[PDB]
Subunit: 251 residues, 4 copies
């Protein structure tokens, strides 16, 4: 409690799954939060299920939309005050090998997973620098930003891109005394509704040859590391990768 | 507050600097703590400065002493109950290149930095497994476990050793459902009394070519990540490296 | 000599600098080579300076051009026979931080550095698999695929993307017994004509805080590791990163 | 051929398996070689099977023996001239988890795998620096220096130690213009007589969940990368890790 007092956060794709868990924990720890998503009926219900409008609101936004990012920041500033924290969580996956990836699939996945993160990071630096906010940008990568998967070619590309681009941002902000930190979070397999809609997926992911703990994680596992990174507790951490994967990348 | 309720922790080298900060934060979050050190006059004062004997006590111990580790665990169990958490923090450094390292220096440094961590990890697994404690072993490595330094040859060796040995332990505990997690923490440069006793050291470490943030960290920077790893918040994290270095390894 | 006998290679951006050195060494070791570039006057001169048309030819191509890639492969097959080796070397750099990167700059850099490599890797797998060629795709990444640089945001992104996407490809080819290997090469600073056209660049890159050897490399340094990876000597290497950087990433 | 002309190399544990393959290829490429081993009957036969005494000789040596290292260098200098190349290949493995490792096992494994490599690296720097030899120290690590294995605790420790200690050495030699390079080689599973004496081992190692290529490697796979690193072709490579593992660490 109170670990995020005074912070104002934007969480993209925060209406379901991991994003929603992060939003929930952020509000519990004193942050004011704006969550984004594509469908207003879902977003408005999600916000209300967490708290009141003085605590959390919803903004309809596709992270691939460059102009919408501006409106998103202006809207959050109008509701809560200067933004201190950005969690770039929205993302999509295609289940194809590099060999079988269509150009259309390639471009659509990179629009959300890479362009989107770039647009949010760029703008976040511009709006949060030099304001004494103890600002923090948390970019969601994945274990797929460390290792390959034969059936996630484009996704691998996007997550590898986010991992290193984030280091460039971290360094520039640090060297210029911007008071903005940038770090990546790398979840392993996490139980989300999606996973539940895919019979046999959880069991395959839980095999010891994949996840040594023999079970997959839950959204709160990612929420707690995000609280640490958004908080002033992590004031000396920037340009780093934080992995929560049940041992997946240790073998 | 309450993030470590019920946990019982041993912190080696916990009478000064980083170890003391970890102990302090652990007690603040509800853990019972046993700190170790070489000098009883310092250790007893350190404990008292943090809390009462029902909260924290001191045990005289050199981490290179295999037999003493047993006594250390027996003593903590007698004072607080079953041990759930071990922070292997004690370590020493020699300022020599591989070329100029004497065999004596080599062996003494590895006795504390590597043998000591092995002895504590081995015993910790044996004493903490299968007890439903949500057990966690936090092994202190360093940025020097990721990158070389021309004047820290032996230290590099020890920290590289701890980094990967910890992954072996993590995997074995995970695969056997031992309910023990093992992770490493990698501090960059941190302001400790030692550093203060070395004129010009802080300034050299703060140069942007070394630490991009242009300043070094403080003991609490390491304490907060240790709270996260000792807590049940990190229940899906094992075999991973957590870096808090002001950007040192990002460039 | 004879280390690449029978191999047929495409090297993108092979008319100057690093690409030209790779082409030169490939021809010396018995490979037949097709080099690409944007300007035919330069390309045709480059080819002739290395060998005869039975050894090396030029094809005008921009790696961002998806359709041209097909023509490129058809043209090489017509001149030399089935393609066994692809070096994805063409790339551009923008000297901007993430904060200052325009969207136009972002898209143009990714078109060459990421889309281009994807288009070539995808097609290479399709054309080279299951032909017993001992096929090898060498994707040029960079030290900037491991660490950030505050003034190379987009470039970092592209090189981080290539690094991990290549692992996905390697795995899929290995698991399917395609007889195609995929690896990345990571040059540090190398003296090319470009560098020479930038007064003070070589000296800045040679500072010990950047390149510990105190000098930058030369194109042949990259050519020799590419010979190894294209040859059957590296038949058990796939999904790996090969770094030739004068110590840059070791500190 | 001729890739190692003029080089004088010591290869520890060079009487069998990987070491012998390296020695064989070194002699083929023009190097003069001294191989070491524990049994003279085996060593003398091994040398003779490769070439004449003007090309290759045997020296009885246990790499854990500090004093013997001096005699080893003096003996090689007397036979071939100044030593330019050192391959620290000798090593042993214990098949135990950290939990089940005896202290005796711990110390004996580190004596060979870590102390031995330190003794050879230290002395190699001292004897090879500043002689214009294009000197190179190749330290044999392993995929087990990157990832954990639940049943190779001590081995993991030793290989993680070698990986980072080597970077310290590389940096010191580079910064001081010693003309000595230090790099590590990381083999995945390789078919050696040992493996053959263990029924079911090769099949277990060849499973796709372990080695994606579906088969293990052969000693020449390691020999060829060692030729590259010992040669002047790799003159700009130092402090780096070279992985040849059939995709093991890519997933
Ligand atoms: Mg793995
Ligand atoms: Mg660095």
């Amino acid at each position: 409690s109170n670990r995020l007092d005074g912070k104002v956060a934007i969480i993209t794709g925060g209406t379901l799954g991991i994003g929603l868990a992060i939003a929930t924990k952020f509000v519990e720890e004193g942050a004011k939060v704006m969550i984004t998503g594509r469908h207003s009926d879902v977003g408005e219900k999600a916000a209300k299920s967490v708290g009141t409008p003085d605590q959390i609101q919803f903004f309809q936004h596709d992270s691939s939309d460059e102009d919408g990012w501006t409106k998103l920041f202006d809207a959050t500033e109008k509701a809560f005050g200067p933004v201190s924290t950005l969690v770039n969580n929205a993302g999509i996956a295609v289940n194809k090998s590099v060999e079988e990836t269509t150009t259309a699939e390639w471009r659509k996945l990179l629009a959300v997973n890479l362009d989107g993160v770039f647009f949010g990071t760029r703008l976040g630096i511009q709006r949060m620098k030099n304001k004494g906010l103890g600002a923090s940008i948390i970019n969601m990568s994945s274990i797929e930003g460390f290792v390959g998967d034969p059936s996630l070619g484009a996704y691998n590309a996007s997550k590898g891109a986010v991992r290193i681009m984030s280091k460039s941002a971290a360094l520039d902000c640090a060297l210029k005394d911007y008071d903005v930190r940038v770090n990546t979070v790398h979840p392993g397999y996490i139980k989300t509704p999606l996973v539940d809609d895919l019979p046999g997926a959880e069991e395959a992911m839980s095999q010891r040859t994949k996840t040594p703990m023999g079970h997959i994680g839950e959204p709160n596992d990612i929420a707690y590391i995000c609280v640490y990174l958004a908080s002033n507790e992590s004031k000396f951490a920037t340009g780093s990768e934080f992995v929560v994967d049940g041992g997946y990348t240790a073998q």
